[PDB]
C-alpha cells in the first residue's frame, strides 16, 4: 500500500491517466501517478514538477 | 528537413477496405507524436486521433474510437490510418500531421500533403460534352458568353481548356457538382468579343485521365 | 472535451486593411504553472494542407510574416492581420491543445472585401446532342458578381422549380474579386417538352429587381 522508494527520472506528462496519494502512515508518503498503461509513478509530494503535474491532472477531473 | 509523406488520392466503393499511410524523413520519428485530421468536402478540421510511435499508445477522439485503426511501424518510420468497411460518409481529405514537442501538449508543426479518399458505389466513366452555344440576341456591352458543360463522369478531376490553351482570360471554369446518380457534372465558361463570333473558333478541350477520355468539342452560335 | 467557436464565420476585408478574427474556447487552455495560453492558428489556402502561423497564443511560428498576430488569454483570443495582403485570403482554424482531443474551431473564411457589382446572367437552353440522349439540362450562369450571395431562382412555365437543380461557385477572382455561379436545371426530355417558358430569375443586392432571363423553347 506504500511506495518503497520515490521515482527519480521525469515525470512523463503525456501519459499520465490520474493520481492519489498514499497514506500517512507510509514511511515515502507520496502522490501515486497512474499511467494510462496502467504503471505506477511514486513520487514526492512536495517536488515543484510533481506539484505541477498534480495541478494539470485535476483540471482535466475538476 | 521535416518531411510526412502521405500515400495517393484512393478511389474506393462502400464496404471495401482500406489503409493509408503518413511517411516521416528528416527527424527522429519516434521522439514525436503523429496525429491524423479529417476534413470533410468544404468543412472544417476533425481531430481523429493520436499515436506514439515510440510504443503505439494510441488516444482516439470519441467520435472516431472503434471507427477507424491508427497504428504506427517504427522500424519503417510509417504512421497508418485504416478502415474495416468504408461508407460513402468516409469521402474526405486525411491529413496527417506531427504533433510539436512541447509540454504537456502541443500544436500540429508539420503536416503531410493530405490523402483524398473517395468512396462511392459509382464506377469510372467518361464524360459527354454538349456545347453551351453563345446567345442568338446582343448583349449589353459587346461581349458573349460560351462555354461547354461536361457531364456524367467519374471519378474527379476533368480538365478544360480554351482553343489548344490559347484562350485563358475570361475563362471560368466551375467546381463540379454531385448528381444523385452518383456521377458528376461540370460547365466551363469563357466570355468573348461578340464580334467574334462570325469568324473566331472556339474549341473546349476536355480531359478526363481515369477513363483516358480527350473530347475536342466546337462551340458555335 | 473543450469546444473551441470562431467568430465571425466569414469576413471580408479591403486590401491593405486590418483584419480581426476571435476564438472562445469553452474552458480556459491557460496552462499555469507553464505560463503559457495552450492555443495555435492555423491557416488554410484552397488545395493546401493547413499551416501553423501561432503558437501559445501569441508566439508566430518561423518565417511567419509580422502582420500576423494572436492575443487573449484564458477563454477569448484574437488573430490579427494587420493589412491584409492578396496572399492572405485564406481559411484561418484556432486550436486547444491543452488537452487531448484538441480540438478545432469551425475556422473562418477571408476575403476580399469590394464593391456591389451586379452578376452579368446568361441561360443556356440544353443542346439538340443531349436532348438526343434523353436529357435536359439548362444553365444559368452568373458572371462576376460581388458579394458571393445570390439567389437563383428557376421558373418553368411560371411554376417554381424545387429540388431539380444544382448550383456551383467559383473561388473568388485573383483579379477583379468577384464571383461566378452556374446553375444547371435538369428534367428528363419528356418533362422538358411538355413545357414551354424556361426562366431563371436572379436575385443580388447588385440588381433593383430580381433579373429574369428566359427562352421558349
Same mark, same amino acid.
Given at each position: 500500500?506504500?511506495?518503497?522508494?520515490?521515482?527519480?527520472?521525469?515525470?512523463?506528462?503525456?501519459?499520465?491517466?490520474?493520481?492519489?496519494?498514499?497514506?500517512?502512515?507510509?514511511?515515502?508518503?507520496?502522490?501515486?501517478?497512474?499511467?494510462?498503461?496502467?504503471?505506477?509513478?511514486?513520487?514526492?509530494?512536495?517536488?515543484?514538477?510533481?506539484?505541477?503535474?498534480?495541478?494539470?491532472?485535476?483540471?482535466?477531473?475538476? | 528537413?521535416?518531411?510526412?509523406?502521405?500515400?495517393?488520392?484512393?478511389?474506393?466503393?462502400?464496404?471495401?477496405?482500406?489503409?493509408?499511410?503518413?511517411?516521416?524523413?528528416?527527424?527522429?520519428?519516434?521522439?514525436?507524436?503523429?496525429?491524423?485530421?479529417?476534413?470533410?468536402?468544404?468543412?472544417?478540421?476533425?481531430?481523429?486521433?493520436?499515436?506514439?510511435?515510440?510504443?503505439?499508445?494510441?488516444?482516439?477522439?470519441?467520435?472516431?474510437?472503434?471507427?477507424?485503426?491508427?497504428?504506427?511501424?517504427?522500424?519503417?518510420?510509417?504512421?497508418?490510418?485504416?478502415?474495416?468497411?468504408?461508407?460513402?460518409?468516409?469521402?474526405?481529405?486525411?491529413?496527417?500531421?506531427?504533433?510539436?514537442?512541447?509540454?504537456?501538449?502541443?500544436?500540429?508543426?508539420?503536416?503531410?500533403?493530405?490523402?483524398?479518399?473517395?468512396?462511392?458505389?459509382?464506377?469510372?466513366?467518361?464524360?459527354?460534352?454538349?456545347?453551351?452555344?453563345?446567345?442568338?440576341?446582343?448583349?449589353?456591352?459587346?461581349?458573349?458568353?460560351?462555354?461547354?458543360?461536361?457531364?456524367?463522369?467519374?471519378?474527379?478531376?476533368?480538365?478544360?481548356?480554351?482553343?489548344?490553351?490559347?484562350?485563358?482570360?475570361?475563362?471560368?471554369?466551375?467546381?463540379?457538382?454531385?448528381?444523385?446518380?452518383?456521377?458528376?457534372?461540370?460547365?466551363?465558361?469563357?466570355?468573348?468579343?461578340?464580334?467574334?463570333?462570325?469568324?473566331?473558333?472556339?474549341?473546349?478541350?476536355?480531359?478526363?485521365?481515369?477513363?483516358?477520355?480527350?473530347?475536342?468539342?466546337?462551340?458555335?452560335? | 472535451?473543450?469546444?473551441?467557436?470562431?467568430?465571425?464565420?466569414?469576413?471580408?476585408?479591403?486590401?491593405?486593411?486590418?483584419?480581426?478574427?476571435?476564438?472562445?474556447?469553452? #474552458?480556459?487552455?491557460?496552462?499555469?504553472?507553464?505560463?503559457?495560453? #495552450?492555443?495555435?492558428?492555423?491557416?488554410?489556402?484552397?488545395?493546401?494542407?493547413?499551416?501553423?502561423?501561432?503558437?501559445?497564443?501569441?508566439?508566430?511560428?518561423?518565417?511567419?510574416?509580422?502582420?500576423?498576430?494572436?492575443?487573449?488569454?484564458?477563454?477569448?483570443?484574437?488573430?490579427?492581420?494587420?493589412?491584409?495582403?492578396?496572399?492572405?485570403?485564406?481559411?484561418?482554424?484556432?486550436?486547444?491543445?491543452?488537452?487531448?482531443?484538441?480540438?478545432?474551431? #469551425?475556422?473562418?473564411?477571408?476575403?476580399?472585401?469590394?464593391?456591389?457589382?451586379?452578376?452579368?446572367?446568361?441561360?443556356?437552353?440544353?443542346?439538340?446532342?443531349?436532348?438526343?440522349?434523353?436529357?435536359?439540362?439548362?444553365?444559368?450562369?452568373?458572371?462576376?458578381?460581388?458579394?458571393?450571395?445570390?439567389?437563383?431562382?428557376?421558373?418553368?412555365?411560371?411554376?417554381?422549380?424545387?429540388?431539380?437543380?444544382?448550383?456551383?461557385?467559383?473561388?473568388?477572382?485573383?483579379?477583379?474579386?468577384?464571383?461566378?455561379?452556374?446553375?444547371?436545371?435538369?428534367?428528363?426530355?419528356?418533362?422538358?417538352?411538355?413545357?414551354?417558358?424556361?426562366?431563371?430569375?436572379?436575385?443580388?443586392?447588385?440588381?433593383?429587381?430580381?433579373?429574369?432571363?428566359?427562352?421558349?423553347?
Amino acid at each position: 500500500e506504500c511506495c518503497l522508494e520515490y521515482f527519480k527520472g521525469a515525470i512523463p506528462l503525456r501519459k499520465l491517466k490520474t493520481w492519489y496519494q498514499t497514506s500517512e502512515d507510509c514511511s515515502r508518503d507520496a502522490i501515486v501517478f497512474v499511467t494510462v498503461q496502467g504503471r505506477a509513478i511514486c513520487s514526492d509530494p512536495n517536488n515543484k514538477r510533481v506539484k505541477n503535474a498534480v495541478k494539470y491532472l485535476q483540471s482535466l477531473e475538476r | 528537413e521535416v518531411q510526412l509523406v502521405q500515400s495517393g488520392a484512393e478511389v474506393k466503393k462502400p464496404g471495401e477496405s482500406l489503409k493509408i499511410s503518413c511517411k516521416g524523413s528528416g527527424y527522429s520519428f519516434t521522439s514525436y507524436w503523429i496525429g491524423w485530421v479529417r476534413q470533410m468536402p468544404g468543412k472544417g478540421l476533425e481531430w481523429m486521433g493520436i499515436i506514439d510511435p515510440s510504443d503505439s499508445d494510441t488516444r482516439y477522439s470519441p467520435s472516431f474510437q472503434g471507427q477507424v485503426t491508427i497504428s504506427a511501424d517504427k522500424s519503417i518510420s510509417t504512421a497508418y490510418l485504416q478502415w474495416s468497411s468504408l461508407k460513402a460518409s468516409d469521402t474526405a481529405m486525411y491529413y496527417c500531421a506531427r504533433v510539436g514537442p512541447a509540454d504537456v501538449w502541443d500544436s500540429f508543426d508539420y503536416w503531410g500533403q493530405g490523402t483524398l479518399v473517395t468512396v462511392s458505389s459509382a464506377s469510372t466513366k467518361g464524360p459527354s460534352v454538349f456545347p453551351l452555344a453563345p446567345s442568338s440576341k446582343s448583349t449589353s456591352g459587346g461581349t458573349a458568353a460560351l462555354g461547354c458543360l461536361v457531364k456524367d463522369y467519374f471519378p474527379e478531376p476533368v480538365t478544360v481548356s480554351w482553343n489548344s490553351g490559347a484562350l485563358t482570360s475570361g475563362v471560368h471554369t466551375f467546381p463540379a457538382v454531385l448528381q444523385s446518380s452518383g456521377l458528376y457534372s461540370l460547365s466551363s465558361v469563357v466570355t468573348v468579343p461578340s464580334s467574334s463570333l462570325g469568324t473566331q473558333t472556339y474549341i473546349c478541350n476536355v480531359n478526363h485521365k481515369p477513363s483516358n477520355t480527350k473530347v475536342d468539342k466546337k462551340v458555335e452560335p | 472535451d473543450i469546444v473551441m467557436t470562431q467568430s465571425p464565420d466569414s469576413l471580408a476585408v479591403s486590401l491593405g486593411e486590418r483584419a480581426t478574427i476571435n476564438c472562445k474556447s469553452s #474552458q480556459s487552455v491557460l496552462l499555469s504553472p507553464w505560463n503559457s495560453n #495552450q492555443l495555435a492558428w492555423y491557416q488554410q489556402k484552397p488545395g493546401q494542407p493547413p499551416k501553423l502561423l501561432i503558437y501559445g497564443a501569441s508566439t508566430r511560428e518561423s518565417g511567419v510574416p509580422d502582420r500576423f498576430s494572436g492575443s487573449g488569454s484564458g477563454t477569448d483570443f484574437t488573430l490579427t492581420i494587420s493589412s491584409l495582403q492578396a496572399e492572405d485570403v485564406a481559411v484561418y482554424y484556432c486550436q486547444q491543445y491543452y488537452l487531448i482531443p484538441s480540438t478545432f474551431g #469551425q475556422g473562418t473564411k477571408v476575403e476580399i472585401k469590394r464593391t456591389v457589382a451586379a452578376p452579368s446572367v446568361f441561360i443556356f437552353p440544353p443542346s439538340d446532342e443531349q436532348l438526343k440522349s434523353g436529357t435536359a439540362s439548362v444553365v444559368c450562369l452568373l458572371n462576376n458578381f460581388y458579394p458571393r450571395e445570390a439567389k437563383v431562382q428557376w421558373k418553368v412555365d411560371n411554376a417554381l422549380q424545387s429540388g431539380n437543380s444544382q448550383e456551383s461557385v467559383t473561388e473568388q477572382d485573383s483579379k477583379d474579386s468577384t464571383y461566378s455561379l452556374s446553375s444547371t436545371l435538369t428534367l428528363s426530355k419528356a418533362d422538358y417538352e411538355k413545357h414551354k417558358v424556361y426562366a431563371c430569375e436572379v436575385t443580388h443586392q447588385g440588381l433593383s429587381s430580381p433579373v429574369t432571363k428566359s427562352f421558349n423553347r
